[PDB]
Design a protein around this ligand. Structure first.
Ligand SMILES: CCC(=O)N[C@H]1c2[nH]c(CCc3ccccc3)c[n+]2[C@H](CO)[C@@H](O)[C@@H]1O
Ligand SMILES: [Cl-]
Ligand SMILES: [Cl-]
Ligand code: NA
Length: 584
């Protein structure tokens, strides 16, 4: 009576200054004429979807909804806001106040109005709203996804659905750069045939409608020629390419030099500098060029606190107005500490862009990455102004991690990874949220066992409980209470997974059915591992029997393509098998 609903992102400023109130079958619409075009179509769609009519003219008594910019200049808006303004905020900023009856939305620019609507959309529940005073704006100005992974590229529907999802969580950047789109890279010189072109146009259109900058990436580095007529012919292919995507409405571009053998720092930068001049600037309404250098992680870029040969020359040749992306201290790493970003930003003498390789799983596909942004410094905004994550080829399940990235990048300072993660699953899964948390909590840590690792540890509280069990048994202390609690945990893993199998929407189930079965198998080996232990009671029969099962469950898990809970549910079984409790 009446609480604020989960919001994503977390708005900069929000306080309850009322009990909230129901919105009528019919509201008062004021401002649609002036307000941002896209912010309004998003309103009408929400309004439609929710059995909420727009008054052909006033009252009664209707709930009063008022919307527009600050340029735009309306009377009801100001009285409505009644103290609050979006006049002194960054681009994409807005204000929202729901005053008993009244609902006021003004953004600084069209962008912020649209976002103000998104926050409205999330605030209303049943027609009920809370009374609140909101001023909101992003920490980082560019926030989004780079579809840059290896593997089957997102389908065309996948992409439209992501692009909508991005609008609703205030992410504003989508970089188009699938490694295995032949035309992005393997055949970069070549024009998209007619029907990809048709499909490409809808991406673009859909993106503008959701205030998403659609960025067109190209990766010519495997075979591009730099010198003489060969270089002219090739640089022209780049133009031809960008032009066609310009002539479709694209006003951002990226040119990527990652994962190639040719380390011609000077030549790469010169291609970029040429494009900045001949395309970007000659066009006037194209956003800054974005690039990744062939050295794109601190280990590859730096030695002894100083740039390496390639990075040094790249840094000094490439135009200041160009956004350079780096991945952090490693290609797939635990963290980006402030000190890493300071270092990299120093070398390029600019605010940097991040290409963050999580939740992407192309380098270890058996595992789904279902955790929150983790390990990224909460003061990164000091040196970084462009933050994107590289997602899984699994579009739907990627949403959980992307959800958290939206809150990290929009409200960096207050970002809490555990709360963000919970919110994300709550917001995305509804009645299934609790069961989905159980499962996903075991699938957050990525680790290919060699060079690639990132993410929150899997099921950390269970892992500490397993640790305590071993400490009490090696000490020869009574552990029956804990043993009993772990039975409940393992039983609850299997219960949740079964509920997920039978009730998940198909769009999500098809991405995780194998991993669901993997956690069920381990939960059963976990349970059999406990029996193995209780069998303490010098019962050799029950011991051999629970042992062959624990061992079979483990072996099934080890053999299976799906990977989950390596250091927790799976490891517990190997820990239990090696705990020799038969000694006298
Ligand atoms: C910043 C550029 C980047 O990360 N490029 C690719 C990239 N390069 C690398 C390291 C190089 C590599 C490539 C293939 C096989 C092993 C290692 C890892 N990754 C990501 C994670 O797999 C891929 O998704 C990216 O497309
Ligand atoms: Cl050459
Ligand atoms: Cl496996
Ligand atoms: Na800068």
């Amino acid at each position: 009576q009446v609480l604020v609903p989960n919001l994503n992102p977390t708005p900069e400023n929000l306080e309850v200054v009322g009990d909230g109130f129901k919105i009528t079958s019919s509201i008062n619409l004021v401002g649609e004429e002036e307000a941002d075009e896209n912010a309004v179509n998003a309103l009408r769609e929400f309004l439609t979807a929710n059995n909420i009519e727009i008054n052909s003219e006033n009252d009664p008594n209707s709930t009063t909804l008022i919307i527009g910019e600050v340029d735009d200049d309306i009377p009801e808006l100001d009285e409505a806001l009644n103290g609050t303004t979006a006049e002194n905020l960054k681009e994409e900023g807005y204000a929202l106040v729901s005053n008993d009856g009244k609902i006021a939305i003004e953004g600084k620019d069209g962008d912020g109005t649209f976002y103000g609507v998104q926050t409205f959309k999330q605030l209303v529940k049943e027609s009920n709203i809370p009374e609140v005073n909101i001023t909101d704006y992003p920490t980082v100005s560019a926030r989004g996804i780079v579809e840059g992974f290896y593997g089957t590229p997102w389908t065309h529907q996948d992409r439209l659905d992501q692009i909508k999802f991005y609008g609703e969580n205030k992410l504003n950047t989508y970089i188009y750069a699938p490694k295995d789109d032949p035309y992005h890279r393997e055949k970069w010189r070549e024009p998209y045939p007619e029907s990809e072109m048709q499909r490409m146009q809808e991406l673009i259109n859909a993106s503008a409608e959701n205030k998403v900058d659609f960025v067109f990436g190209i990766s010519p580095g495997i075979d591009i020629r730099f010198d003489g007529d060969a270089g002219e012919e090739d640089f022209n292919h780049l133009i031809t390419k960008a032009e066609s995507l310009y002539d479709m409405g694209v006003r951002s571009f990226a040119i990527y030099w990652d994962d190639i053998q040719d380390k011609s720092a000077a030549k790469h930068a010169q291609v970029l500098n040429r494009f900045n001049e001949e395309f970007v600037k000659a066009k006037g309404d194209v956003k800054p060029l974005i690039t990744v250098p062939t050295e794109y992680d601190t280990g590859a870029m730096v030695s002894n606190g100083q740039p390496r040969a390639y990075t040094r020359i790249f840094a000094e040749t490439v135009d200041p107005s160009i956004e350079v992306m780096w991945t952090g201290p490693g290609v797939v790493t635990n963290e980006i500490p402030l000190s890493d970003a300071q270092l990299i930003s120093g070398i390029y003498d600019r605010n940097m862009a991040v290409w963050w390789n999580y939740p992407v799983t192309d380098y270890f596909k058996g595992k789904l990455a279902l955790g929150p942004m983790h390990g990224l410094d909460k003061g990164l905004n000091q040196y970084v102004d462009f933050f994107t994550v590289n997602p899984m080829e699994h579009a739907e399940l990627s949403k959980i991690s992307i959800h958290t990235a939206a809150d990290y990048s929009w409200n960096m300072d207050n970002y809490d990874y555990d709360k963000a993660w919970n919110r994300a699953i709550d917001m995305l899964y509804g009645d299934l949220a609790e069961d989905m948390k159980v499962f996903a909590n075991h699938s957050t840590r990525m680790d290919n066992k060699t060079w690639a690792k990132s993410g929150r540890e899997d099921a950390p509280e269970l892992r500490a409980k397993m640790d305590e069990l071993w400490n009490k048994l090696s000490s020869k202390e009574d552990a029956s209470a804990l043993i009993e609690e772990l039975y409940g945990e393992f039983a609850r893993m299997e219960e949740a997974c079964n509920n997920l199998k039978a009730n998940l929407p198909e769009v999500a189930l098809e991405e995780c059915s194998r991993q669901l079965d993997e956690l069920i198998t381990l939960a059963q080996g976990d349970k059999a591992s406990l029996d193995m232990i209780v069998a303490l009671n010098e019962d050799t029969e029950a011991y051999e029997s629970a042992k062959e099962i624990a061992q079979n469950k483990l072996n099934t898990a080890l053999s299976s393509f799906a990977v989950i809970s390596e250091k927790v549910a799976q490891s517990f079984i190997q820990e239990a098998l090696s705990f020799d409790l038969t000694l006298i």
